[PDB]
Design an enzyme around this catalytic site. Structure first.
Site, PDB file in Angstrom:
ATOM      1  N   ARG A  53       0.853  -1.125  -0.054  1.00 23.04           N
ATOM      2  CA  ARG A  53       0.165   0.097  -0.100  1.00 23.04           C
ATOM      3  C   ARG A  53       0.762   1.206  -0.008  1.00 23.04           C
ATOM      4  NH1 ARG A  53      -4.015   3.271   3.817  1.00 23.04           N
ATOM      5  NH2 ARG A  53      -2.231   2.901   5.216  1.00 23.04           N
ATOM      6  N   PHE A  58       1.840  10.506   1.751  1.00 22.34           N
ATOM      7  CA  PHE A  58       1.449   9.680   2.726  1.00 22.34           C
ATOM      8  C   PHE A  58       2.588   8.847   3.305  1.00 22.34           C
ATOM      9  CE2 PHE A  58      -1.933   7.051   4.868  1.00 22.34           C
ATOM     10  CZ  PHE A  58      -1.554   7.244   6.049  1.00 22.34           C
ATOM     11  N   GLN A  61       3.749   1.277   2.614  1.00 21.39           N
ATOM     12  CA  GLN A  61       3.391   0.324   3.846  1.00 21.39           C
ATOM     13  C   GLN A  61       3.970  -0.945   3.278  1.00 21.39           C
ATOM     14  OE1 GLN A  61      -0.412   0.757   5.096  1.00 21.39           O
ATOM     15  NE2 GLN A  61      -0.306  -1.426   6.359  1.00 21.39           N
ATOM     16  N   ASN A 100      -0.688  -0.902  12.193  1.00 20.77           N
ATOM     17  CA  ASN A 100      -1.624  -1.535  13.114  1.00 20.77           C
ATOM     18  C   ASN A 100      -2.864  -1.426  12.655  1.00 20.77           C
ATOM     19  OD1 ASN A 100      -2.831   0.715  14.516  1.00 20.77           O
ATOM     20  ND2 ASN A 100      -0.971   1.117  15.486  1.00 20.77           N
ATOM     21  N   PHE A 111       5.703   1.025   8.204  1.00 18.01           N
ATOM     22  CA  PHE A 111       5.449   2.003   7.041  1.00 18.01           C
ATOM     23  C   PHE A 111       6.592   3.167   7.012  1.00 18.01           C
ATOM     24  CE2 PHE A 111       3.521   5.603   9.047  1.00 18.01           C
ATOM     25  CZ  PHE A 111       2.855   4.952  10.399  1.00 18.01           C
ATOM     26  N   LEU A 120      -0.903  10.720  13.080  1.00 16.50           N
ATOM     27  CA  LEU A 120      -0.801   9.370  13.625  1.00 16.50           C
ATOM     28  C   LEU A 120       0.265   9.528  14.958  1.00 16.50           C
ATOM     29  CD1 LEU A 120       0.262   7.713  10.152  1.00 16.50           C
ATOM     30  CD2 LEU A 120      -1.913   7.919  11.423  1.00 16.50           C
ATOM     31  N   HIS A 124       0.208   5.213  16.251  1.00 12.63           N
ATOM     32  CA  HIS A 124       1.434   4.222  15.953  1.00 12.63           C
ATOM     33  C   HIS A 124       2.685   4.700  16.258  1.00 12.63           C
ATOM     34  CE1 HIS A 124      -1.191   2.935  12.243  1.00 12.63           C
ATOM     35  NE2 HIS A 124      -1.718   4.230  12.629  1.00 12.63           N
TER      36      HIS A 124
HETATM   37  N1  LIG Z   1      -6.824  10.647   9.051  1.00  9.02           N
HETATM   38  C1  LIG Z   1      -6.220  12.053   8.505  1.00  9.02           C
HETATM   39  C2  LIG Z   1      -5.968  12.025   7.146  1.00  9.02           C
HETATM   40  O1  LIG Z   1      -5.213  10.893   6.841  1.00  9.02           O
HETATM   41  C3  LIG Z   1      -5.295  10.574   5.320  1.00  9.02           C
HETATM   42  C4  LIG Z   1      -4.233   9.621   5.313  1.00  9.02           C
HETATM   43  N2  LIG Z   1      -5.044   8.454   5.429  1.00  9.02           N
HETATM   44  C5  LIG Z   1      -4.886   7.860   6.839  1.00  9.02           C
HETATM   45  O2  LIG Z   1      -4.703   8.471   7.835  1.00  9.02           O
HETATM   46  C6  LIG Z   1      -6.054   6.562   6.895  1.00  9.02           C
HETATM   47  C7  LIG Z   1      -7.421   6.736   6.953  1.00  9.02           C
HETATM   48  C8  LIG Z   1      -8.168   5.164   7.280  1.00  9.02           C
HETATM   49  N3  LIG Z   1      -7.750   4.445   6.547  1.00  9.02           N
HETATM   50  C9  LIG Z   1      -7.070   2.967   6.863  1.00  9.02           C
HETATM   51  O3  LIG Z   1      -6.896   2.984   8.060  1.00  9.02           O
HETATM   52  C10 LIG Z   1      -6.720   2.261   5.900  1.00  9.02           C
HETATM   53  C11 LIG Z   1      -6.892   0.847   6.053  1.00  9.02           C
HETATM   54  C12 LIG Z   1      -6.432  -0.044   5.104  1.00  9.02           C
HETATM   55  O4  LIG Z   1      -5.672   0.439   4.114  1.00  9.02           O
HETATM   56  N4  LIG Z   1      -6.882  -1.402   5.205  1.00  9.02           N
HETATM   57  C13 LIG Z   1      -6.551  -2.367   4.194  1.00  9.02           C
HETATM   58  C14 LIG Z   1      -5.969  -3.693   4.844  1.00  9.02           C
HETATM   59  C15 LIG Z   1      -6.673  -4.224   6.041  1.00  9.02           C
HETATM   60  C16 LIG Z   1      -7.308  -3.130   7.036  1.00  9.02           C
HETATM   61  C17 LIG Z   1      -8.292  -3.778   7.846  1.00  9.02           C
HETATM   62  C18 LIG Z   1      -7.772  -5.016   8.666  1.00  9.02           C
HETATM   63  C19 LIG Z   1      -7.218  -4.854   9.712  1.00  9.02           C
HETATM   64  C20 LIG Z   1      -6.746  -6.025  10.359  1.00  9.02           C
HETATM   65  C21 LIG Z   1      -7.138  -7.356   9.813  1.00  9.02           C
HETATM   66  C22 LIG Z   1      -7.908  -7.363   8.578  1.00  9.02           C
HETATM   67  C23 LIG Z   1      -8.372  -6.395   8.091  1.00  9.02           C
HETATM   68  C24 LIG Z   1      -7.766  -1.900   6.096  1.00  9.02           C
HETATM   69  C25 LIG Z   1      -6.395  -2.458   7.992  1.00  9.02           C
HETATM   70  O5  LIG Z   1      -6.378  -1.495   8.457  1.00  9.02           O
HETATM   71  N5  LIG Z   1      -4.934  -3.028   8.061  1.00  9.02           N
HETATM   72  C26 LIG Z   1      -4.083  -2.124   8.836  1.00  9.02           C
HETATM   73  C27 LIG Z   1      -2.570  -2.951   8.807  1.00  9.02           C
HETATM   74  C28 LIG Z   1      -2.327  -4.113   9.801  1.00  9.02           C
HETATM   75  C29 LIG Z   1      -1.254  -4.130  10.527  1.00  9.02           C
HETATM   76  C30 LIG Z   1      -0.920  -5.113  11.454  1.00  9.02           C
HETATM   77  C31 LIG Z   1      -1.910  -6.251  11.327  1.00  9.02           C
HETATM   78  C32 LIG Z   1      -1.587  -7.350  12.261  1.00  9.02           C
HETATM   79  C33 LIG Z   1      -0.976  -7.404  13.402  1.00  9.02           C
HETATM   80  C34 LIG Z   1      -0.427  -8.372  14.132  1.00  9.02           C
HETATM   81  C35 LIG Z   1      -0.608  -9.766  13.673  1.00  9.02           C
HETATM   82  C36 LIG Z   1      -0.255 -11.066  14.249  1.00  9.02           C
HETATM   83  C37 LIG Z   1       1.299 -10.919  14.941  1.00  9.02           C
HETATM   84  C38 LIG Z   1       1.617 -12.257  15.471  1.00  9.02           C
HETATM   85  O6  LIG Z   1       1.045 -13.293  15.713  1.00  9.02           O
HETATM   86  O7  LIG Z   1       2.903 -12.250  15.834  1.00  9.02           O
HETATM   87  C39 LIG Z   1      -1.338  -9.830  12.303  1.00  9.02           C
HETATM   88  C40 LIG Z   1      -1.781  -8.682  11.818  1.00  9.02           C
HETATM   89  C41 LIG Z   1      -2.905  -6.233  10.689  1.00  9.02           C
HETATM   90  C42 LIG Z   1      -3.266  -4.921   9.933  1.00  9.02           C
HETATM   91  C43 LIG Z   1      -3.755  -0.833   7.893  1.00  9.02           C
HETATM   92  O8  LIG Z   1      -3.618  -0.945   6.826  1.00  9.02           O
HETATM   93  N6  LIG Z   1      -3.822   0.151   8.862  1.00  9.02           N
HETATM   94  C44 LIG Z   1      -3.898   1.717   8.340  1.00  9.02           C
HETATM   95  C45 LIG Z   1      -2.410   2.312   8.407  1.00  9.02           C
HETATM   96  C46 LIG Z   1      -0.963   1.679   8.176  1.00  9.02           C
HETATM   97  C47 LIG Z   1      -0.017   2.425   8.415  1.00  9.02           C
HETATM   98  C48 LIG Z   1       0.061   3.437   8.702  1.00  9.02           C
HETATM   99  C49 LIG Z   1      -1.029   4.364   9.020  1.00  9.02           C
HETATM  100  C50 LIG Z   1      -2.314   3.648   8.726  1.00  9.02           C
HETATM  101  C51 LIG Z   1      -3.643   4.267   9.093  1.00  9.02           C
HETATM  102  C52 LIG Z   1      -4.345   4.936   7.645  1.00  9.02           C
HETATM  103  O9  LIG Z   1      -4.035   4.682   6.541  1.00  9.02           O
HETATM  104  N7  LIG Z   1      -5.209   5.785   7.748  1.00  9.02           N
END
Ligand SMILES: NCCOCCNC(=O)[C@@H]1CCNC(=O)CCC(=O)N2CCC[C@](Cc3ccccc3)(C2)C(=O)N[C@@H](Cc2ccc(-c3ccc(CCC(=O)O)cc3)cc2)C(=O)NCc2ccccc2CC(=O)N1
Length: 163
Positions: A53, A58, A61, A100, A111, A120, A124
């Site tokens: 991603r 931004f 990832q 997360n 990321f 963030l 994070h």
């Molecule tokens: N807001 C003001 C304006 O900002 C504009 C800019 N856009 C922003 O600021 C935006 C706005 C909001 N948009 C969003 O969140 C985007 C979300 C997205 O793409 N996805 C696609 C992918 C899956 C989804 C939903 C999900 C989560 C979980 C499991 C299944 C489905 C949703 C998701 O959430 N997946 C997360 C990562 C993630 C990390 C870690 C794990 C994990 C941890 C541990 C273990 C086991 C360990 C062990 O057993 O040892 C297994 C898995 C799972 C998922 C994701 O991607 N998080 C989003 C994110 C990532 C990085 C940085 C920032 C952001 C926030 C963002 O992007 N926010």
């Protein structure tokens, strides 16, 4: 503080090396997880996986080496692990931080910021920064999109520890 590297390619063409300093002095548990996933010393890790991603102005990832889509990954601790602290801030391009799915859900996904992502802070865990190869990060970013889907397959072809 440990130094680690990611060698990145786009559709098989090398882009170059990113060198990351990990702030073990502030977040030792988070730094150690990333370090070990770069070396592959536990038998699994980042090598061969993708930046899945990438959103311009931004962040880029990566680290979902199980599902390759932002849903997976695995830490070195056996389970999702707590936010160690929120001491370091998302101050600008080059910050390395944990992805997360809410509080205390750290795994392997991470990321690299390409702007100050101050909204963030406190959400994070920041744990390092780019010290060489920010131009490679900008190249990765150039293959991103509004949705975050990449226009080329961006692969960590090799990774490991430098010191
Ligand atoms: N807001 C003001 C304006 O900002 C504009 C800019 N856009 C922003 O600021 C935006 C706005 C909001 N948009 C969003 O969140 C985007 C979300 C997205 O793409 N996805 C696609 C992918 C899956 C989804 C939903 C999900 C989560 C979980 C499991 C299944 C489905 C949703 C998701 O959430 N997946 C997360 C990562 C993630 C990390 C870690 C794990 C994990 C941890 C541990 C273990 C086991 C360990 C062990 O057993 O040892 C297994 C898995 C799972 C998922 C994701 O991607 N998080 C989003 C994110 C990532 C990085 C940085 C920032 C952001 C926030 C963002 O992007 N926010």
């Amino acid at each position: 503080n440990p130094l680690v590297y990611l060698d990145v390619d786009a559709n098989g063409k090398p882009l170059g090396r990113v060198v990351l300093e990990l702030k073990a002095d502030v977040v030792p548990k988070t730094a150690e997880n990333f370090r070990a996933l770069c070396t592959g010393e536990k038998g699994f890790g980042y090598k061969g996986s993708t930046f899945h991603r990438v959103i311009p102005s931004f962040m880029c990832q990566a680290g979902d080496f199980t599902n390759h889509n932002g849903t997976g990954g695995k830490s070195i601790y056996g389970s999702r692990f707590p936010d160690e602290n929120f001491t370091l801030k998302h101050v600008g391009p080059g910050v390395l931080s944990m992805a997360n799915a809410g509080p205390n859900t750290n795994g392997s996904q991470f990321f690299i910021c390409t702007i100050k992502t101050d909204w963030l802070d406190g959400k994070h865990v920041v744990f390092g920064h780019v010290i060489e190869g920010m131009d490679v990060v900008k190249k990765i970013e150039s293959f991103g999109s509004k949705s975050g889907r990449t226009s080329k397959k961006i692969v960590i072809t090799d990774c490991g520890q430098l010191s």
